[PDB]
Structure formats: C-alpha cells, structure tokens
Design a protein around this ligand. Structure first.
Ligand SMILES: *Cc1cc2c(cc1C)nc1c(=O)[nH]c(=O)nc-1n2C[C@H](O)[C@H](O)[C@H](O)COP(=O)(O)OP(=O)(O)OC[C@H]1O[C@@H](n2cnc3c(N)ncnc32)[C@H](O)[C@@H]1O
Ligand SMILES: O=C(Nc1cc(Cl)cc(OC(F)(F)F)c1)Nc1ccccc1CCO
Length: 451
C-alpha cells in the first residue's frame, strides 16, 4: 500500500530536525497509506538478517536526532477519511480517533468544525504530531489541571517492534498502552490515538503581569495551580531588565456565550488575590483558536527574518518545587546572568499516571524550566557557547543535588539512562523493550538500546 522513496529532499528532511545538529541519514523514507503499511515495513525489519532501524518522524521537532534512523528507514507519518468525534455515555464525554501522524493544529480544526469540541490539554506549539507528543508527554499551561496530553488519551493502536498491530488501553494490553505513553518510541509506532475532548471555549482572556521578586512569583504560580474559581492556563517566563531579571506570570480565563457575562469579575477576583507589580497587568481578548496558535504566529515572523531554520540547543528540565529558589539564584541570576525564551511554571504530579513511561521528579509539585534559546544564523560559535551554558546548568543541578529530570531527554550513555529512570523504572522499561522491540529496531536515535 505504501511507497519507499529515495528522493533527495525526502532523505534530507528525514536526516535533520529542529535541533539542527544531528544528521544521521536513512537509506529510504517510507510513505504509508494506513497502519497495515507501517506494520509491513516494521515486520520486514524484524524478519531481515541485519535488522535495519525504523523510526517514525512526526513533524521533525526533535532536538538531538530522536526521529533519525541511521542507514535504515524513516516512516514519514505526515498526512484520507477522518473519524468524526464520538460521544460515549460510559466515558461521560467525547473522544476522537486520529492518525498517529496527524498534527495537533489539524486535530483542533477537525474537532471544532464537528461539534465545537477540542482536546483539553495542549502543547504551546500545535505543529507537532499526536504520536510525537504522546511519546514524550505534551505539556503546556493546562497540564496543572488536566495533566499532560498522555493523561488525556483513552486508547491506541500500536505497531510493535515485531510488526504486530495491537489495540491497547487501561483495560486491554495496559503494559503496552502505559509503556508507549511517554515511552520515547521504544515499544512501537502509534498509528491511532483516541483523544479525550471537551466542548471548546469560544474566547480567551489572555493576561500577563510582571514580578521582580522570585519568591512572590513562584508562591503565586504555586497557589494558582492548587485552585471553584481558577485560571485555565498557568505559565511564566524569565525576562531581562532591558525591554537584573523580571518574571512574567501568564494566565488565561476561557469563556463562551454563557460565561461571557461573568468573565470580567472572575478575572478581577483571581487577580486581586495575586502579588504582581502594580500597573504591569497587560490583557488581550481573542478567539480560542488564535490563542492556541500564538507560537505559529511567532514562527512566521522568525521565518521572515531567516531566524527559524537555525540550530536550537533547547534544554527542558523538571525541577522539584523544594529546589526552585536555589535554581533561580544559581541559574537565572548565576549561569544566565549577563535569543530565545526561558519558560517556567509548576505542575501537579497527581495528574501524571505513574504507570506511564514518563519520568518526573519524586515530588508532588515540580516545575518545567524550558531553556528555548536559538543560536545566531550561520554562526557555529553561538551554538557552542549555548551548549556550554546548558552543560553549566546540568553541572549546577548535579553539584547541588537538585533531583531534576530532563524532559525530551538527550542522554546517550547507559549509566545516564539508568540514573534518569532509577532502578524500578529502568527495570520496567528494559522488560518492555525485551517484549515489544527485542531487536531494538525502533527509535534508535534516542540512543537507549542497541541490537
Ligand atoms: C520544535 C518545537 C517542539 C516543541 C514545541 C515547540 C517547537 C517549536 N513546544 C512544545 C510544547 O509546548 N510542549 C511540549 O510538550 N513539547 C513541545 N515541543 C517538543 C515536542 O513535543 C517534541 O519535539 C516531540 O518529539 C514531538 O515532535 P514531533 O511531532 O515532530 O515528533 P518527532 O520529533 O518527529 O519524533 C519524536 C520522537 O517520537 C518518535 N515518534 C514520532 N512519531 C511517532 C509515532 N507516531 N509513534 C511512535 N513514536 C513516534 C520519533 O521516532 C522520535 O523518537
Ligand atoms: O517551545 C515551546 N514554547 C514556545 C513559546 C513561545 Cl512564547 C515561543 C516559542 O518560539 C519558538 F521559536 F518556537 F521557540 C516557543 N515550549 C516547549 C518546547 C519544548 C518542550 C516543552 C515546551 C513547553 C514549555 O511551556
């Protein structure tokens, strides 16, 4: 059903990612029409004498070659009749079946046009594949309340490393279901995901407020994620004094025709309880789709300046709330003291299922700290200096015993992976690999296992 391609542009695309550093080339790019085509290719890899590498590529947003299959085959999962949202009286809500390669932006547009429904949990950027985010976590300002995207999926169809198509959920083949979720593509290729949906808000009241005091900033973020009147989105970012560091709190209040008359007072009541700097509240009112697509608008302005297709040495850390104060002193004021955002916001561990493959710190409240800096165009030394700064951040966490965990981990050494997972989780991860991908065919670019 599918076709192997040796088109130079297809090979070049499959040999790069948003990170702009890793460049392992496959022999071919596979364009499937359906799940059975992916099953056929993985099946052939499992049966082959050499056991060539097979990796699914979402939208190629990996930082360090995680979707690359050196001298093997890259499956171009990009997109055919689409399933309509479905109501279930047993689940108490709606769901939608999506192809693993579908972009979240296309999922949103589909569910809105078919009943004004939408996923409850997002990523900041919607030009990411469903299978791609579900293999990591998929995090944004909604995760404190709904959990990451891996906590908002009912079922999957997975093509294992043996080329077998398996339907899994909490009730059917749960070890495969929970293993695949946050599983870094190690146990199979997601060909279908059954996404949880809610009736979509029509509009968003988008607020930003500034802080000079990190203790007040974090205390307000932690209080907001514990909230009943509440914001629907809680993020934050680190700001340089030139418009000394400032912290910007970023919140939203979702509303529709019914709640439009109470939105102004809900916002005012919530804001009155906060300790931001007076006169620093900035507000925007816009459609729900426009808010969700805000990062793609930043992307178009970057592509126009030749500032998008540059190296991205991005670093993402989960930091226990008990160590966040020390983190600001040594990192925001220390390492980074003196191009790209630095995001920071807490989340609730109870919204993360411990049965999944996702690795979070051993604390109920933890922060995501996202160092999203870009190197200068055509300037290799800029990338090198940013890479040294990232190593200084990791050395700082190691040196002060901060139990930080990397999100989208870029580890390569076996002892680094053992340390990342810890003994219990590593044992469960290795046993899943032995069962579902014994020949280590899948997502070898993650650098965890070898044939
Ligand atoms: C580039 C980028 C990334 C990003 C983001 C904004 C930008 C500009 N904003 C994010 C956000 O707000 N929240 C978040 O959680 N992540 C965010 N990201 C990072 C993003 O989640 C990751 O890059 C992730 O990998 C998804 O990106 P993508 O869809 O492009 O997937 P990939 O890079 O090609 O593949 C990643 C790994 O997953 C395996 N894979 C891919 N598809 C599948 C399927 N269908 N089944 C199983 N495994 C799959 C790849 O082989 C690779 O190992
Ligand atoms: O890329 C992210 N946000 C994002 C936010 C803004 Cl305002 C601009 C932006 O511009 C650019 F050019 F794309 F960088 C990106 N987020 C992300 C990335 C990886 C892991 C986790 C995260 C979630 C952190 O909330």
């Amino acid at each position: 059903g599918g076709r192997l391609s040796v088109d130079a542009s297809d090979i070049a695309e499959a040999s790069r990612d948003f990170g702009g550093v890793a460049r392992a080339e496959p022999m071919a790019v596979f364009h499937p029409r359906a799940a059975g085509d992916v099953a056929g290719l993985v099946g052939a890899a499992f049966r082959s004498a050499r056991g060539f590498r097979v990796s699914a590529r979402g939208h190629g947003h990996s930082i360090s070659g995680q979707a690359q299959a050196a001298g093997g085959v890259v499956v171009d999962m990009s997109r055919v009749a689409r399933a309509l949202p479905v109501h279930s009286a047993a689940l108490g809500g709606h769901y939608v079946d999506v192809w693993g390669g579908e972009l979240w932006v296309d999922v949103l547009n589909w569910t809105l046009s078919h009943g004004g429904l939408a996923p409850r949990s997002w990523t900041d950027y919607l030009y990411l594949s469903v299978g791609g985010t579900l293999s990591n976590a998929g995090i944004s300002g909604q995760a404190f309340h709904h959990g990451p995207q891996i906590s908002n999926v009912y079922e999957l169809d997975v093509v294992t490393g043996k080329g077998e198509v398996v339907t899994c959920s909490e009730t059917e083949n749960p070890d495969l279901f929970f293993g695949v979720l946050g599983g870094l593509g190690q146990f199979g290729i997601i060909t279908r995901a059954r996404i949880a949906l809610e009736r979509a808000p029509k509009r968003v009241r988008w607020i930003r407020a500034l802080y000079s005091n990190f203790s007040e900033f974090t205390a307000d973020q932690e209080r907001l994620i514990s909230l009943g009147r509440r914001f629907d989105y809680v993020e934050g970012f680190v700001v340089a004094a030139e418009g000394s560091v400032l912290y910007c709190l970023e919140v939203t209040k979702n509303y529709d025709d019914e709640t439009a008359g109470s939105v102004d007072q809900d916002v005012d009541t919530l804001l009155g309880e906060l300790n931001f700097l007076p006169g620093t509240v900035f507000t925007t009112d816009l459609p729900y789709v426009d808010f969700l697509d805000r990062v793609h608008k930043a992307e178009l302005k970057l592509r126009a300046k030749g500032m998008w297709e540059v190296p991205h040495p991005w670093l993402n850390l989960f930091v226990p709330a008990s160590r966040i104060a020390d983190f600001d002193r040594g990192v925001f004021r220390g390492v980074l003291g003196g191009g790209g955002p630095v995001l920071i916001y807490p989340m609730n561990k109870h919204k993360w299922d411990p049965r999944s493959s996702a690795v979070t710190p051993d604390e109920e409240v933890f922060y995501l700290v996202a160092f999203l800096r870009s190197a200068l165009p055509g300037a290799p030394e800029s990338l090198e200096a940013l890479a040294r700064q990232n190593q200084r951040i990791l050395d700082f966490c190691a040196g002060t015993g901060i139990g930080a965990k990397q999100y989208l981990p870029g580890h390569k050494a076996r002892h680094e992976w053992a340390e990342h997972f810890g003994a219990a989780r590593w044992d469960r991860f290795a046993r899943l690999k032995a069962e579902f991908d014994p020949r280590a065919i899948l997502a070898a670019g993650q650098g965890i296992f070898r044939p």
